[PDB]
Structure 1
Amino acid sequence: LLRKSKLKPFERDISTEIYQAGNKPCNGVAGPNCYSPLQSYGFRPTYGV
């Protein structure tokens, strides 16, 4: 849910990294002004349609 350069048709990018949303270098732990992509879903049987 967080990645630039919208995918070209029929390509797959399995590349987990640390998003650089901000203006500072970011290595390892995201912390402030830095995020991590690939958020999960969650699923329960009582969920609405």
Structure 2
Amino acid sequence: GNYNYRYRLFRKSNLKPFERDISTEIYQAGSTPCNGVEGFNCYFPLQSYG
């Protein structure tokens, strides 16, 4: 498994053309705020291809 290549699974909004997002901030996927901490409906945006 080559896991060195990652894609942005989670984001709040669609990008502009020729826009790059490298920010490793947490995503809030539920009603509960995450405060930078993983948990219930709190996921890392970058997941690797298997």
Structure 1 residue ranges, 4+ long, deviating more than 4 angstroms after superposition: none
TM-score of the aligned structures, taking structure 2 as reference length: 0.67
Structure 2: 5+ residue stretches without partners? 1-8
What fraction of aligned residue pairs are identical, expressed as a percent?
83
Aligned pair count?
A: 42
Q: Can you give the 5+ residue segments of structure 1 that lack an aligned partner in the other structure?
A: 43-49
Q: By percentage of residues, which structure has more strand? A: 2
The alignment's C-alpha RMSD in Å is 1.3
* Greater length-normalized contact order (CA 8 Å, ≥ 6 residues apart): 2
Larger of the two Rg values belongs to structure: 1
